[PDB]
Curated annotation (Swiss-Prot), chains A, B:
Role this protein plays: Utilizes succinyl-CoA to convert toxic acetate to acetyl-CoA and succinate. Required for growth on acetic acid and for resistance to high levels of acetic acid. Also has low activity with acetoacetate as substrate.
GO molecular function, one term: acetate CoA-transferase activity
PANTHER family, per database record: ACETYL-COA HYDROLASE (PTHR43609:SF1)
Alphabetized Pfam families for the sequence: AcetylCoA_hyd_C, AcetylCoA_hydro
Positions annotated to bind CoA: 268-272, 363, 383, 387, 407
Protein name stated in the entry: Succinyl-CoA:acetate CoA-transferase
GO BP annotations listed: acetate catabolic process; acetyl-CoA biosynthetic process from acetate; succinyl-CoA catabolic process
Family: Belongs to the acetyl-CoA hydrolase/transferase family.
Amino acid sequence: TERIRNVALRSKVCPAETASELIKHGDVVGTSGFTGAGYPKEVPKALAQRMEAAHDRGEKYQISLITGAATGPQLDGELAKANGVYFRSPFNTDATMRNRINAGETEYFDNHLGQVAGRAVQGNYGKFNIALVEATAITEDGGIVPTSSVGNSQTFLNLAEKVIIEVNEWQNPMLEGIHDIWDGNVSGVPTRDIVPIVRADQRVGGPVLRVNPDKIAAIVRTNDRDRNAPFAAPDETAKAIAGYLLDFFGHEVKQNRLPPSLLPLQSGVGNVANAVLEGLKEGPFENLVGYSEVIQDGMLAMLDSGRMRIASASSFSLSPEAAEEINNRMDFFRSKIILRQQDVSNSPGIIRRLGCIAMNGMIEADIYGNVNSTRVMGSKMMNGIGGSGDFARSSYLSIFLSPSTAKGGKISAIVPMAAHVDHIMQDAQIFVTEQGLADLRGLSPVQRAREIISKCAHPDYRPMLQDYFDRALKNSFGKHTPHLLTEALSWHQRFIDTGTMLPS
Amino acid sequence: TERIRNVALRSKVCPAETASELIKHGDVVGTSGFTGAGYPKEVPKALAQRMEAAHDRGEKYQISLITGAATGPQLDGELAKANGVYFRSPFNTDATMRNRINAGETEYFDNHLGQVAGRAVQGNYGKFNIALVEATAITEDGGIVPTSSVGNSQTFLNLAEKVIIEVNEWQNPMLEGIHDIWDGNVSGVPTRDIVPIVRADQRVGGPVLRVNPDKIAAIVRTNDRDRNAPFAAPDETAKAIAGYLLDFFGHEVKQNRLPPSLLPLQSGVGNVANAVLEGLKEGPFENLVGYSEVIQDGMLAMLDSGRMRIASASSFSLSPEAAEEINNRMDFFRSKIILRQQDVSNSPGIIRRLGCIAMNGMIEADIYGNVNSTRVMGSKMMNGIGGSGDFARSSYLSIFLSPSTAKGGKISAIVPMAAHVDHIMQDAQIFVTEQGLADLRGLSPVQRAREIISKCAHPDYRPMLQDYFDRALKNSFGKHTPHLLTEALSWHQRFIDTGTMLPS
Ligand SMILES: CC(C)(COP(=O)(O)OP(=O)(O)OC[C@H]1O[C@@H](n2cnc3c(N)ncnc32)[C@H](O)[C@@H]1OP(=O)(O)O)[C@@H](O)C(=O)NCCC(=O)NCCS
Ligand SMILES: CC(C)(COP(=O)(O)OP(=O)(O)OC[C@H]1O[C@@H](n2cnc3c(N)ncnc32)[C@H](O)[C@@H]1OP(=O)(O)O)[C@@H](O)C(=O)NCCC(=O)NCCS
Ligand SMILES: [Cl-]
Ligand SMILES: [Cl-]
Ligand SMILES: [Cl-]
Ligand SMILES: [Cl-]
C-alpha cells in the first residue's frame, strides 16, 4: 500500500538513482544502519554505480561515510567495490570495505558507538551535508518511523543540511511503536540532560524520528532485505564456553552476589556471544532483561522461550532466517523489544546505573588480561571496537568470551602480549574459553596471569605461556607486570613468518 | 575547642598503639586518604612498629590496604618499610611502597578511582574487617566530619566490621561544611540512583560521614600534618606546554566551539598542571569552573582572583604555602569549594553530562596515540591509572600533556608502540608537548601518526619515528594501524640494555 501516510511529502518522491545525485564529491554523509539492520540500500547501490562511472571518466567522487555502526552489502559493500569512501566511521563488517581499510584506501576510525553522536555534534567529522535514513513509514504529521534499527539517525537528521529518506516496504509495519526516541539533550552541547531511564524496559520518548520537512530533499520507495551473515550453530567449543559461564552465574547467585534474575544483559556482536544466549534460553535464570546494543538471533530465542521478558537495544541484528521468523511473528515480539538511539543504549551513565552484565567476544587476550577486539597482528582491522568499550568499562561485570585458539589451532587466543589493546585489565574481570573460566576480581597482574594461563589457555600453548611468564618473572625490568620485550610480540611475528604460532 | 561533640563516643577514645592492636594479620583495611591528604597517620605508624617486631620474631603480620587514592609517608611509607602489606589498591605515590610493588613483595591493582567503591561493595577485595578514617570532628549526633579529602571513606565505613577514627587537631575546624556526602546509591547494589548533579557547584548531600556508633571500636586523638610531594615551579618545558594548550583553548573559543568560560576543568597534578593553571589565570577567559579530583595551588589562586567561580573535587593537593593560605582563610575558600565522595567526583555519568575537559599527564604515547600512564617498559609501575580513565573516556575533550622526552633525553615519550596501554586511541583527542600540539579529532590512525610525529615528537627522535612509520607502511601485516612487530618494542629494550633509546 502507501507507507507515506503524509499526503504532502508524497510530492518529494524521486527515483533512488535521482536521489543519489544529491550526494556530491567530498560530502560528509550520515546514514541510518546499525550492523546488518536498517541501513539505506537503494540510494547507495545507485550512488555506487554512479561513482564507478565517474572514476573511469577521471572524475573524483568520494564521500565521508558516518553511520550508526555496520551496514551491509548494499551500502558498505557497493561503495567499497566502487572505491567511493575516503573516510569511514565508526564500525564496519563488510569484507570489501574491510579490504579498502586494510589497504590504506579508506581512512577509518572506530569510535566508541555511544560517543559517535556527541562527536558528530562537536564537529569532529566536519559538517554533515547529507543524512540518508531508511524508514518503515512516514506518519501523517511527518514523523519518520525507523526500521530494524535506530542508531544515530536522529542526530544525523538534526545535523545534516539535506535529508533523504528510504521508505522500505520490506520492513514489517508493526515496527511502528517499537522504537523510543528521546527529544532530550543526550549528545548535544553541555550541560546535557539527565536521561531518566531507571529500568531497561522504561520508555521515555516517542515512536518517531523528527525532522524539518523543509530539509527533506528526497523520498525513495524500496523493497529490499536487511542482509546480515547467519550465526554459527553452536559447536562443542561454543557450548563449553556457554557451560562455564552459566555455571559461574549460578555460583554468583548462590553466593548472593547476583539476583536469580541476574542483571540487565548486554551481548556483543558475533558468533560466540550469540552462542552464550542460546545457552541462556534454557538456563535456570528467569525473568531476564536485556539492555544491549543489538539483539542477535540468540537474544530473540530468549524472548521466545520467555526466559527473557524484554530486551532493550538499538537494533535487531538477525540472520536472514531469523529476520523472517520475527517478521511472521511481529505481533509477538513487538511488545518484548524497545529500540533506542545508540547514544542512549550505549550511555555509560545508564549502563552503570542499571548494573549491566557485559558479554563480549575478542580476538585475543594477553596473560595479564588485556583484550584485543579489533586488530589482528596489531595492524589488520577486523570489525571495530563497537560498543564493547562503552559496556566493558561501565558494566557491573565485564566478561570476555573466545575459543582458546583460532585458525585451526595455528593461533593462540591467549598470548604473551596482545598486539593491540582495546580493553585494559581494569575493564575485564572474567574470561571464558572452551578450556575454562578465569575469575580475575581483586587480583594483581601476576595473579591474573596465573588464572588466565591455568584456566583459559589451550594445552598446546599453556606450557609456552608458562615458560614466558616464568622467565619474565625472573628477568623483567620490573616485576609488577613482568614482560620480556624481546619475546612479547614474537608469537605474532612467528605466525606472520611461518603461518603458525607453534614453534618448529 | 573539643572536637568530639558526641559525649557517648568520648568513652571510646584510646591510644594509637592500643587501637592498632585491633588490626589483625590478614585483615582487609579500608582507609580515608586521597593523594597526600586526609589519610590516617598515627594508627598506621603504630601498626608498622608492631608488624616489624612480629616479623623480627618470625611471625607473619600483613594486611590488605584499600584506600581512596595515594596516602603519604605515615601510611604507605611506614607500612611498606615494615613489609606489612600483602595487597594494595587502587593508587600509590609512596616510593617505598612503589618499590615493594615493583619487587613483587606487595600485590597491586590500580582500579579506576571512580569504580573502587563499587567494586569494594561487590566484594572484589573481600570482606572489610577495618575502616580507619581521619576526622576533623565528631558532631553532636555522631556524624564524622572528614578532613582534607573524602575519598572512599563513606563506603569503607559502611562495609567494615569495626571502625577506628583518628580525630586530627591539625586539621582546620572550618573544614566542617566543605564536604558533600550523599546517602544516595552511587556504588551500591543495582539499580543505582540517578546522581542528580547538573551543575559543578551543586550539593546533593550533607556535611558528615554516617556510621553506626556501635561499630566504632576506637577513637584516637591525633595531631599530625598531611604530607604531599613539594611544589614544582614550572620550568621552560612546562611553560611551553601550557602555552600551546592555552593557544588551543583560545582558538576553540574564537571558533565558537567553546564558551569564553570554557567547560568544567579536570586537571592532574604535575609541573605542567601548575603552568596550565597559571596560564588559565592570566588568559582571555572568565567564569571558569573546576570539576576535578583535586584542588591545587593554581585553583586556589583563581578562586581568590575570581577567575574560577567554584571548584569541585574529592581532595586538596596543596603546597605547604598554599595550605598556609587556605588554613588562614578557610572561611572564604570553603564557600568556593565542594569536596565530594570520589565515586561522585569521578562518576562518568556526571563527567559526561557536565562536559568536562580532561587534562592528564602520561608516561608515553605511541605514534597512533595510544597512551601509557603507568608502566615504564611495560612492567615497572609508577603511580597508577588513577582517575585518568574515568575522565579521559567521559570528557567532552581528552587532552594528554607531557615533555616529549624523559630521562634527560635518553627516552622518547613518543614511541613506535607503547609498552603498556592505559588509554586507547578512542580516549585521547589532543596531545601537547613542548614541541607543539596535535589535534587528532576525526583522524584515522595513520592520520594520527602524521600529526603526532610532526607536532609532538622531539626533533632528535623524529627521524627514527618517521623511519619506523614509513617502513611499517610498506611492510605491516595490515595497513590500518601499521607496525613492524620485529621493532615495535625495540626502543624500550634498547633502554633496558643500554640506558638510552638512541642508537648511534
Ligand atoms: C572479536 C570478534 C571479531 C569475534 O567474533 P566471534 O564471532 O565471537 O569470533 P569467532 O570465534 O567466530 O571468529 C571470527 C573471526 O575472527 C577471527 N579470529 C578470531 N580470533 C582470532 C585471532 N586470535 N587471530 C586471528 N583471527 C581471529 C576468526 O578467524 C574468524 O575468522 P574466520 O572464520 O574467517 O577464520 C567480534 O566479537 C567483533 O567484531 N568484536 C568487535 C566489535 C565488538 O566488540 N562488539 C561487542 C559489542 S556489540
Ligand atoms: C604519568 C605521570 C607519572 C606523569 O607525571 P608528570 O609529573 O606529569 O610527568 P613528569 O615529566 O614530571 O615525570 C614523572 C615521572 O615519570 C617518569 N617518566 C615520565 N615519562 C617517562 C617515560 N616516557 N619513561 C620513563 N619514565 C618516565 C619521570 O622520570 C618521572 O619519574 P622519576 O622521578 O623516577 O624520574 C602522572 O601523570 C601519573 O601518575 N598519571 C596517572 C594518574 C593520573 O593521571 N591521575 C589524574 C589526575 S592527577
Ligand atoms: Cl543520565
Ligand atoms: Cl577488581
Ligand atoms: Cl546518574
Ligand atoms: Cl573523533
